[PDB]
Amino acid sequence: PKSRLFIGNLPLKNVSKEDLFRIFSPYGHIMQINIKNAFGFIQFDNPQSVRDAIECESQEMNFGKKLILEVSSSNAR
C-alpha cells in the first residue's frame, strides 16, 4: 500500500534514501522519500509501520517547537 510519515527536528543531519531506509527498515515497510527544510516527509507501505517508525525511532508523543511527527494514511487505488 501507500502511506505517509512526517518528521520535524530529527532530519537536520545529512540524509539520503538509504539512511532513512536502514534506520526504519526493522520498524516499517517503506516506499519513497521527500525531504526539505528542518523537516522531512517519507511515504511508506502500511500505516501501522508508519506509527512504529516515528513512535519507536523518534518519540511516541509530539512536543511544540521541540519534536514534531505525524502518522498519515490515504485511500487505496
Side-chain angles (χ1 to χ4, degrees):
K2 84 298 192 61
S3 213
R4 286 171 61 229
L5 188 163
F6 186 111
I7 327 175
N9 213 251
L10 182 161
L12 280 55
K13 195 74 194 289
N14 285 10
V15 74
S16 296
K17 66 193 290 178
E18 182 166 21
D19 300 86
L20 59 88
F21 181 98
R22 73 190 180 207
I23 68 105
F24 293 127
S25 275
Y27 300 82
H29 300 110
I30 225 281
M31 274 291 144
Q32 59 181 109
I33 71 162
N34 182 19
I35 301 186
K36 187 183 298 177
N37 198 5
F39 299 94
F41 326 122
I42 310 168
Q43 291 79 8
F44 263 71
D45 180 19
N46 180 276
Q48 302 180 0
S49 122
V50 170
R51 52 77 169 159
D52 296 334
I54 34 61
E55 298 188 314
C56 198
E57 177 56 39
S58 192
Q59 188 55 267
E60 192 169 84
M61 194 184 180
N62 74 97
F63 199 107
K65 303 188 291 170
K66 202 184 72 162
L67 189 66
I68 302 89
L69 71 302
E70 196 171 90
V71 52
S72 282
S73 193
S74 51
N75 289 348
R77 301 297 180 168

